[PDB]
Amino acid sequence: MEATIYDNTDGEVDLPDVFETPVRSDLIGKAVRAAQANRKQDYGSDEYAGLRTPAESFGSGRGQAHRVPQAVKGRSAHPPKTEKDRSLDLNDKERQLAVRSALAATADVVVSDDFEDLVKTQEVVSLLEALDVHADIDRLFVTSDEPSTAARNLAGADVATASEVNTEDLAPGRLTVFTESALAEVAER
Amino acid sequence: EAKAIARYVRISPRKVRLVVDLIRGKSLEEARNILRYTNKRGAYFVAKVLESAAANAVNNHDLEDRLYVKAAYVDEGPALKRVLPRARGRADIIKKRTSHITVILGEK
Amino acid sequence: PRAKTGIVRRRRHKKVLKRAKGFWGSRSKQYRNAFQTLLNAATYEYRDRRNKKRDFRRLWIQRINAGARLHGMNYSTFINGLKRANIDLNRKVLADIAAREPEAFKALVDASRNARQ
Amino acid sequence: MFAIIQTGGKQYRVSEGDVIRVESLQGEAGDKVELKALFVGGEQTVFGEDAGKYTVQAEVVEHGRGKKIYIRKYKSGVQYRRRTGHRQNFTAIKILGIQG
RNA sequence: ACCGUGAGGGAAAGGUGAAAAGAACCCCGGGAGGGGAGUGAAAUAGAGCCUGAAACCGUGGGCUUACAAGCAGUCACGGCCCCGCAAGGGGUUGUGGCGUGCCUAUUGAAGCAUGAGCCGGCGACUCACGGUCGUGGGCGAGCUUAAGCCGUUGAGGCGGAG
RNA sequence: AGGUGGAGCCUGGGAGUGAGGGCGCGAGCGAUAACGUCCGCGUCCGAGCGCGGGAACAACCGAGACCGCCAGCUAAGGCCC
RNA sequence: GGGGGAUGACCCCAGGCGGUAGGGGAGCGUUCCCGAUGCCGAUGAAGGCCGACCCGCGAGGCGGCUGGAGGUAAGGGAAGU
């Protein structure tokens, strides 16, 4: 539906059943999730130290009791185990799915191919004053196959491609635009 | 009114304590003979912390004599953790419980 | 993943402490038996919580006698006569009366004695 | 000015000094309201009569406020590994002793 | 540094300030250290000198103490003392009234069974690969290895042995 | 049959103790001796089946502890102090 | 559990509610990663010091004094709690 065409005074495109649809928060986040995930890092606390030194835990029958943990700086107890499998491979289907319905959420904004041409990050200050606001606030670049040159740089960068530009992408709250070839990712859809 | 003092004071906080607990709240000049002719150490000391006391005042805190010690006290701190005979094996240290020494000198 | 619990525990304690009036020499600040002594005091209060209302059931008990007898008789008499009552039955306040308003008390005292014999 | 009726509980010995009164969330709501309170303790100006003589007339007092639990704590504890804590309840809405 | 002949063990201890402008001079004093002046936004920021809590030692004040028992104490009633949430509460208790601490292991515990002198901080059901039920949800044939490519942010997307 | 009323049955995940005593009774042993032990029928306690009583006393008689200090009837047990 | 719940909630009565291993449900603060069309503070971050409003609660808020610079997340996520 209200597939608004850029250039504004120019044409209007149709809404693809796809996007249309309802919503699926659950998956929603999920998509999310299986994001940061496969995308964090890792850490831990000494293997040597935390089980590093010799140790004469002391005889006994003397006034004491006993190279392990529970007397200082040393030991750990179950710490950063770098050996901390961090990944989280969501699932294909899963994923894709998300972005989708995801985007669907986006709809709730049409980048005329013709733009795949403009040649200065001050021509953005332009096609800007075209239609600004707060949602632009969000914004969210993206051409269709080979990014929106210079369009890529400014105080809101980010240039997905009609392929490659998912939820991690904008999914977040956010608001943006896609060069047809963009909706070339819809096909991906 | 004014006051005298001094920390890092090597001595039996306690002992000290008796010190004033005497000459305590009383006429200057007066006790000024208590510690002059009393006994146990501290005195000496104690005395001292009365002169830069009587002084400080008149000098920069001002009416002589008519003065005395509205109040006087001592505190311990800093210790002197001291090592002694290894339980003939393990250490046994005492502590010359450093010693603070404040004391008032206000005018009648 | 540091846990410097810190600042926190300390607090708690303060907590209790408060729970910590100035009771007995020590506990006073006894960050233990401090705490303890508590538990104790508590439950105590409790049982006291329901207690009292008793200590009363009796209190009036005497201040009551003080009179119930005064005139000339006990609380197994009165009582009996009292319940001979019909549109009037109470006990608590009764006392704190016999003493507050002599006449008043004095009264019933009669209507009573009678009801009885 | 000093009477002694009795409500869903004696709670009596009054006249005008509004007496913190047991709940009653059905007639109360009535802010500064008026309502009847059976007697049975006629003590006025040094003259008395059966609390059964009474049980005929009575009084009334204006539904004043809604005292909010006057603090009171209940350390529920025991050496027997059982603790816990709940604060006061009993309020009540206040109301003056409308005597008659 | 330190105990060990040796092989070896193996600590503690960081933080003034915007910068020293780091305290000339005068005072009691053998000095250290304390009294003034001066820097200064503040030095109860002052030289191991940011925050600087508790335990623990002091100095004054309120109340309280000499025919009196229990850690405790908490319920009642009373007098002194203060009412920046006033006709209600603060604090302290004189009496009386009912009261065996606290943890582990125990048939059973006040304990005379053990655990702990006091305070502060560390300190104990975790992660991975499997499998196992339950549940949140994507398609019913469902689902992905490893890798190839794409990668301020770095954007996932193809890979079909299993 | 069922007055009841709220236990019952199967499938399935998660368990704990795997050694207790005390009392009445019916038996075993035992000097019909033990706060002895050994099996049974009910209860009892479970570190709270916390409160009442029997002075004090888990525990034996009564009792089932959501909470309400200045209510009311009783239980068992009591009422010269 | 059940009689209608508009999202609350409200009404009846049935109906208990003492509980350690141990089983099920619900909540609280601790340091971090979001800043799901989120940013406060030199007329104080925060910790500290003290309190007769908010909650069954574990905590909250809020006001007075301290102290030199931070970090808070209305919501979901994580864990050396």
Considering only CA atoms, which of B14, B70, B10, B22 is closest in space to residue B47? B22
In order of their start, the domains of chain B are: 1-108 (3.90.470.10)
Distance in angstroms: CA A167, C1' G61: 39
What would the two tokens of residue B79 be?
Answer: 């210790």
DSSP sequence for D30-94: STT---B------EETTEE--HHHHTT---B--B---------B----BTTTB----B-----B-
In angstroms, the CA D25 to CA D35 distance is: 13
In angstroms, the CA A72 to CA A56 distance is: 15
Residue C79 sits at the vertex; the CA angle it makes with C73 and C82, to the nearest 5 degrees, is: 105
Q: Which residues of C touch D80 (CB under 8 A)?
A: none
In angstroms, the CA C82 to CA C109 distance is: 9
In angstroms, the CA B28 to CA B67 distance is: 6
In angstroms, the CA A93 to CA A77 distance is: 39
Q: What is the residue range of C87's domain?
A: 1-117
What would the two tokens of residue A71 be?
Answer: 């007397």
CB D92 within 8 A of CB D21: yes
Query: Do C88 and D50 make contact, defined as CB atoms within 8 angstroms?
Result: yes
Q: Say how many residues make up chain D.
A: 100
In angstroms, the CA D26 to CA B88 distance is: 84
Q: Which of C38, C41, C93 sits opposite D41 (nearest CB)?
A: C93
**In Å, how far is D53's CA from the nearest CA of chain C?**
7
Considering only CA atoms, which of C116, C88, B35 is closest in space to residue D50? C88
Query: Do D48 and C107 make contact, defined as CB atoms within 8 angstroms?
Result: yes
Q: Which residues of C touch D51 (CB under 8 A)?
A: 87-90
Resolution in A: 6.8
**In Å, how far is C32's CA from the nearest CA of chain D?**
14
Burial of B56 (0-12, 13-18, 19+ CB in 10 A): middle
- Tell me the three state secondary structure of residue C26: coil
What would the two tokens of residue C28 be?
Answer: 């006073």
Considering only CA atoms, which of A108, A124, A123 is closest in space to residue A174? A108
Amino acid at A13: V
CB B97 within 8 A of CB B76: yes
Q: D35-56: buried (b, 16+ CB within 10 Å) or exposed (e) per residue?
A: eebebbbbbbeeebbbbbebbe
Q: Which residues of D touch C107 (CB under 8 A)?
A: 48-49
Name residues 18-77 of chain D within 8 A of C (Cβ). Answer: 40-41, 43, 46-55, 73-77
DSSP sequence for A59-97: -SSSS-----SSSBSB--SS---SS--------TTHHHH
What would the two tokens of residue C61 be?
Answer: 């008990």
In angstroms, the CA A98 to CA A104 distance is: 9
CB B9 within 8 A of CB B104: no
Q: How many domains, in total, are found in chain C?
A: 1
| Strand F nucleotides in reach of protein CB atoms, 7 A cut-off | 47-48, 50-51, 67-73, 79
Residue of C nearest to D39 (CA): C88
In angstroms, the CA B21 to CA B18 distance is: 5
The answer to whether strand F lies under 7 Å from the CB of residue C79 is yes
What would the two tokens of residue B52 be?
Answer: 């830069």
Amino acid at C70: L
What would the two tokens of residue D100 be?
Answer: 């008659």
What would the two tokens of residue D30 be?
Answer: 């009535």
In angstroms, the CA D44 to CA D14 distance is: 11
CB D41 within 8 A of CB D5: yes
Most C CBs within 10 A among D5, D15, D50, D53, hence the mutation to make, goes to: D50
In angstroms, the CA A160 to CA A75 distance is: 47
Helices C8-19 and C35-50 meet at what angle, rounded to 10?
40
* DSSP letter assigned to residue B13: H
Q: Are strands B2-4 and B102-105 parallel, antiparallel or unpaired?
A: antiparallel
Query: Do D54 and C92 make contact, defined as CB atoms within 8 angstroms?
Result: no
The answer to whether strand G lies under 7 Å from the CB of residue A16 is no
Distance in angstroms: CA A110, C1' F77: 93
Could you identify the residue whose CA is nearest to the C1' atom of nucleotide G55? D87
Long-range interactions of B50-53: CB distance < 8 A, separation 24+: B50/B4, B50/B23, B50/B103, B50/B105, B51/B4, B52/B4, B53/B2, B53/B3, B53/B4, B53/B103, B53/B104, B53/B105
**In Å, how far is D21's CA from the nearest CA of chain C?**
16
CB D71 within 8 A of CB D88: yes
H-type alpha helices, chain A: 17-20, 25-31, 94-97, 99-107, 124-130, 135-138, 183-187
DSSP sequence for C57-110: HHHHHHHHHHHHTTTS--TTTHHHHHHT-SS----TTTHHHHTS-HHHHHHHHH
Main-chain phi, psi angles of B73, to 5 degrees: -150, 165
